[PDB]
From a paper:
Proteolytic processing of the SARS-CoV-2 polyprotein is essential for viral replication and depends on the action of nsp5 (1, 2), which encodes the main protease (MPro), also referred to as 3C-like protease (3CLPro). MPro is a clinically validated target for SARS-CoV-2, with the MPro inhibitors nirmatrelvir and ensitrelvir used clinically to treat COVID-19. Starting with a lead-like dihydrouracil chemotype identified in a large-library docking campaign, we improved MPro inhibition >1000-fold by engaging additional MPro subsites and using a latent electrophile to engage Cys145. Herein, we describe the discovery of uracil-based, nonpeptidic MPro inhibitors exemplified by the advanced lead molecule AVI-4516.
A structure of AVI-4303 bound to MPro at 1.58 Å revealed that the isoquinoline occupied S1 as expected, whereas the benzotriazole unexpectedly bound the S2 pocket and the C6 chlorophenyl side chain stacked in a region between S1′ and S2 positioned near the catalytic dyad residue His41. Compared to the binding of AVI-3318 then, the uracil core in AVI-4303 was flipped ~180°, albeit still anchored by the strong preference for isoquinoline at S1. With the AVI-4303 series binding primarily the S1 and S2 pockets, we noted that the unsubstituted N1 position offered a potential vector toward the shallow and comparatively solvent-exposed S1′ pocket, which is also adjacent the catalytic Cys145.
Numbering used by the authors:
A (entry chain B): 1 to 305
B (entry chain A): 1 to 301
The structure:
Amino acid sequence: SGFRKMAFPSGKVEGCMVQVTCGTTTLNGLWLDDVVYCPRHVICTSEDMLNPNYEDLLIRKSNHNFLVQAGNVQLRVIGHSMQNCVLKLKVDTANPKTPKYKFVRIQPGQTFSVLACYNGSPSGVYQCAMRPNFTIKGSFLNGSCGSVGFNIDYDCVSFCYMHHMELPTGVHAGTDLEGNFYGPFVDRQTATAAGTDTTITVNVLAWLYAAVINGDRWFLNRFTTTLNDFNLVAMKYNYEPLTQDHVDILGPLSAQTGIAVLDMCASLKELLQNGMNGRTILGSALLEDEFTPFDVVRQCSGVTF
Amino acid sequence: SGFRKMAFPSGKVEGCMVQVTCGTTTLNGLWLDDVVYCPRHVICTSEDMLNPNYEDLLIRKSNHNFLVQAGNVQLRVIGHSMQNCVLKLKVDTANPKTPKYKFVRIQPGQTFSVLACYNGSPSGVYQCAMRPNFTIKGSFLNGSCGSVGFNIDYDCVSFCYMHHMELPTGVHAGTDLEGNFYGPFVDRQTATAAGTDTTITVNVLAWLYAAVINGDRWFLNRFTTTLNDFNLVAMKYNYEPLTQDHVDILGPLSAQTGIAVLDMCASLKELLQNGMNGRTILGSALLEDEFTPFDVVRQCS
Ligand SMILES: O=c1[nH]c(-c2cccc(Cl)c2)c(-n2nnc3ccccc32)c(=O)n1-c1cncc2ccccc12
Ligand SMILES: O=c1[nH]c(-c2cccc(Cl)c2)c(-n2nnc3ccccc32)c(=O)n1-c1cncc2ccccc12
Ligand SMILES: [Cl-]
């Protein structure tokens, strides 16, 4: 029993983190096979960050301008290229600790484990969700760029996030590993801000199932709802639409608890309309929305990697 | 910016996790140099657990009755010894991935990371605290025993917890890596009562400082309190007393923010007495008590 913010074991990713230095800037890179991936703004001075044309800025660099430190060994850079916002440094040595891996782009609401690093060295690991407004509520200090987010499935690490920037309100923006930012954010100095956010409905439902699995049941009720009737209520409370796919993905939790998804939806409807009336669910006084259905299954069923 | 329940990277501990089988029971062990540590109740059946004579039960076991597997590689046990409530299984091979390590016994209120494992393989990693009643609010299923808690103190892995049992409350109890239980719990079936779980006041104050560092300031006020007067309000609300040592440990955060510790006590006093009035602090509608002062400094600077 129990339910915690639970990250994937991070060892497979730790073995891939390196330090990348260009000029007076140091940040983190991800070393997979014979390529090191890092944010392309490693080549930028703070002065460069205004209307930068990265094609100019990168042609003014050579291989010897990049210093890649992998523990006690210096990897020699033998080529470089950029894939949209991600710089790819070709090195002379394939990382012998490369895990089985994929690059995936996740959807708003999906979660991942962040391995926060400084100077190529892992510092901590925590869970994040990609918010509907395409930010993440991370914990990142100066020097954390190039830290990555990932999920694991069996023996395969699926990298889905590379950290690039902090926004004015203290939330974070970054790219997938193929170099495309999540959301309208850009690796240049602009006066932009995160937009209005919403609550990830399918995740709140997953977490209510986690609560039932752990014995917290006070919020259940006798009612059911149709999917459309639920969504008419959800929109009023700034919740994301629940799709039929979300209902399907919640199936395993419904089977394990015996509570139909639309029955859970009626429970959530009543919590939104009445509040929690001083009670708590899994130690929280708010409805938690950064556990996916799979996060609940992997934790409550003891999946290993 | 930002503030998250952050665990230490688990890779150094992953390299020490092994599977330990005795009879039909499989749980986890910790492989350091040529020794594997695991809960001694691995040798018990559920019927043995009703009234176990661990000394007699261990005498009856042989080295070959302990099956140890590191990944898909089998290790041969060449000795077995009581270590309070854990077993030390001597094996043929020193673990080549043994990190620099020490065994530390932690204090109530201190935090640590847990690598939850099943059958010798890792499931996930999370942060938790040793509660004032010497339980931990973990996430553990059947088969998780032998999973360990740890901190990474600079150049060294500090192992502080090995998991042994879930109490009827759904919270968890275990030993340090010397095999001595935290709290009054025992590795046998009892009508074990758990003490009063109280809130870790020094940690709540640390987390309020984290909130100010991150820009949440609405809860500060111009009232004042003495330490004794604050502590009277604290235990009214089932908070632990705040000691002079706690005040000094909050020194670095009070210096960074410019807010005296007793002035933050005045803020916490008002929050306890009036509530939050529908506002949140660091994304929470409740006061968080599982970040130590050290956790906040580590994460915020
Ligand atoms: O580390 C970083 N480096 C840089 C940086 C980029 C280029 C050159 C240089 Cl010299 C630096 C960041 N910038 N700055 N302007 C940007 C504009 C668009 C994109 C990224 C940007 C940045 O946001 N972060 C940070 C990341 N996460 C948390 C942080 C907390 C506190 C301070 C910085 C944090
Ligand atoms: O895995 C475990 N194994 C055993 C066990 C011990 C001896 C023999 C056998 Cl055959 C089994 C546990 N027991 N049982 N009585 C005990 C009495 C004192 C100490 C430990 C005890 C135990 O509590 N746990 C568990 C640990 N954490 C979470 C759990 C969730 C759900 C079920 C079990 C959980
Ligand atoms: Cl809360």
